[PDB]
């Protein structure tokens, strides 16, 4: 498409006929990258309170 060809001066006579190919019509699909690896570290912080005040 011409949208990705905004450089140089190609004659591309297709622009004057029906198959202009100016932009992606219908619009192109949008792939997405995989989400970055994230860790739920807060599971490591849940634990019993200090029992030293209430032990034998």
């Amino acid at each position: 498409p011409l949208v990705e060809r905004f450089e140089t001066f190609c004659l591309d006579p297709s622009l004057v006929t029906k198959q202009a190919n100016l932009v992606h019509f219908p619009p192109g699909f949008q792939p997405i990258p995989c989400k970055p690896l994230f860790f739920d570290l807060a599971l490591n912080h849940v634990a019993f309170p200090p029992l030293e005040d209430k032990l034998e």
């Binding site: 450089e7 140089t8 019509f25 792939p31 990258p33 970055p36 690896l37 309170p49 209430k54 034998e56």
Partner: protein, 436 residues
């Protein structure tokens, strides 16, 4: 049995690692005595470690009358966050009397889930710089995940997990060649680790994305198919792989496209993925509905997406495509016109599409007029080439040479003596030579 004996057994079993029988003896203490805040704290901790967040939430809500003192702010907030109740968890963290390290780290995770990447990045920088523990590599890779997400979607210039996240950041920044090399380094680091194949599955899923971006569609498709057949336990990764396969297939493999879509909308997907990913998924399935004659649902998805005003993906084009597919595109004319008028910042590409629609069958002069209206991209060699050939089609030589003059003047004003500048001058010179 003596209460200190039960407490000693509780402490021993808690340091042992398992929690079910620890919970059983904690509730035995509870039935012994109803007013020991340590006992209910141990109970909610056991419930959280056992994965029953709803039960701990219910316990906290029922015993809020007697809790008082310091309150189970962190435990309640964690139960809400793990129950996808992020909005209530925000105020649960914010309404706590005192802020602890566990609360701050939970707040950072919640902010990451809220896509508030600025405050999340700041708080996680503070977490890494301040708190030292046995999971500092995990904090480093989480911070790297945050910066990768910000660079990938918010457009912000910045162990195998850290290498993979660095590759994700490089993908976001636009680099593709070195991303493959870094992913191969992470693949080596993973291969030497397990000798657990899901951590290699995600690496290969990111590898296939780079393969697809560079044009090597066949190898990307084979990699994606092998990752899908490997059956990883993640759900967001499956959605990402499925919609990337959607983008690869386009309008050819619709039968597999439906399968990928059904894998794209599963339980917990809306929470694992970012808002930008979900919006791109909505765009992709609206496109698929268009290519599969499903017009009403396509329009519904387009309207719902426009209601959110997406930053990067404008869905009105899809609706325009609808009105271009059903051949009554006269309404699409004014639809794109008014959308461009209401959104001047996004009007440029809308008018670029407008021109293509106005060269579809006729009215070429109006197409040139609306091409001239795109001031942002007016002085580009490709567009001026298109304008010149269109004007030469109907022999509007004066308009073509005046377009040349405006382009040359703007280039002289902004970037004199550019290679594209000199190319424009030479092309104009020979055009004038061959047309007087």
């Amino acid at each position: 049995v003596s209460v200190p004996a039960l407490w000693s057994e509780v402490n021993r079993y808690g340091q042992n690692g398992d929690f079910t029988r620890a919970l059983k003896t904690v509730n035995k203490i509870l039935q012994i005595n109803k007013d020991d805040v340590t006992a209910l704290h141990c109970k909610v901790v056991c419930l959280i470690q056992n994965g029953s967040f709803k039960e701990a939430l219910n316990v906290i809500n029922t015993h809020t009358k007697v809790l008082a003192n310091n309150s189970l702010s962190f435990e309640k907030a964690y139960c809400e966050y793990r129950l996808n109740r992020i909005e209530n968890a925000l105020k649960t963290i914010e309404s706590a009397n005192q802020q602890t390290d566990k609360l701050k780290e939970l707040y950072g995770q919640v902010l990451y889930r809220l896509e508030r990447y600025d405050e999340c990045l700041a708080v996680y920088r503070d977490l890494v710089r301040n708190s030292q523990d046995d999971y500092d590599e995990e904090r480093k890779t989480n911070l790297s995940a945050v910066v990768a997400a910000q660079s990938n979607w918010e457009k912000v210039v910045p162990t195998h997990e850290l290498c993979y996240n660095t590759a994700c950041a490089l993908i976001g920044q636009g680099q593709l060649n070195q991303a493959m090399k870094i992913l191969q380094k992470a693949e080596d680091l993973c291969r030497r680790s397990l000798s657990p194949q899901a951590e290699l599955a995600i690496i290969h899923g990111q590898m296939a994305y780079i393969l697809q971006l560079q044009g090597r569609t066949e190898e990307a498709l084979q990699l994606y198919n092998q990752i899908i057949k490997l059956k990883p336990t993640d759900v967001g990764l499956l959605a990402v792989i499925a919609n990337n396969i959607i983008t690869i297939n386009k309008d050819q493999n619709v039968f597999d496209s439906k399968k990928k879509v059904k894998l794209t909308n599963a339980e917990g997907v809306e929470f694992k993925l970012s808002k930008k990913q979900l919006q791109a998924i909505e765009f992709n399935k609206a496109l698929l509905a268009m290519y599969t004659n499903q017009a009403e649902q396509c329009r519904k998805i387009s309207a719902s997406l426009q209601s959110q005003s997406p930053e990067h993906l404008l869905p009105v084009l899809i609706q325009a495509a609808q009105l271009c597919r059903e051949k009554q595109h006269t309404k699409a004319i004014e639809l794109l016109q008014e959308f461009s008028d209401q959104h001047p910042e996004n009007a440029a590409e809308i008018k670029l599409t407008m021109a293509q629609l106005k060269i579809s069958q006729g009215n070429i002069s109006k197409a040139c007029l609306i091409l001239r209206s795109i001031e942002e991209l007016k002085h580009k060699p490709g567009m001026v080439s298109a304008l010149v050939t269109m004007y030469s089609h109907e022999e509007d030589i004066d308009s073509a040479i005046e377009v040349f003059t405006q382009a040359i003047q703007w280039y002289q004003n902004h970037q004199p003596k550019s290679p594209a500048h000199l190319s424009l001058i030479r092309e104009a010179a020979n055009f004038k030579l061959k047309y007087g």
